[PDB]
Amino acid sequence: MLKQVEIFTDGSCLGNPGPGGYAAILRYRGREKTFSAGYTRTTNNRMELMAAIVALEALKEPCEVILSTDSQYLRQGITQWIHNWKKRGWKTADGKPVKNVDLWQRLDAALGQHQIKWEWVKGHAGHPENERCHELARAAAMNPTLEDTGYQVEV
Structure with missing residues (x-):
């Protein structure tokens, strides 16, 4: 087996x-x-x-x-x-909860245990796995089944 854990991810909307x-x-x-x-x-x-x-x-x-x-x-x-969000207690400089705080905190908790090397690939130069994620995410968007409970509207 691979001696590092590999993750590939994509979001589409x-x-x-x-x-x-x-x-x-x-x-x-x-x-x-x-x-x-x-x-x-x-x-x-x-x-x-x-x-x-x-x-x-x-x-x-x-x-x-x-x-x-x-x-x-x-x-x-x-x-x-x-880094700065954590320093500020997950608040903006104007004292409000940061945008998508629910998911940023959930992600932060999920990252806590791990030594992560981030690879920021460009959209047109992804690996086959990146292309596969993109195709999967787009198909999922065309067939939605879940509610994004934590989404709120400002922009």
């Missing part, structure tokens, strides 16, 4: 908000798990978070992970914001 979906591929314990699900009313940004959350939550002990995705919102948060 045409509307803002609209029907959306996520997909993730996880190589863990010598197996390849694939997760995908669609939501009636959500955003692309929230689907990018969900995909990473669901894959990372499947890990049951601390792991060494390489997570690969073209997800720009996820990338922006991890590389530019999450």
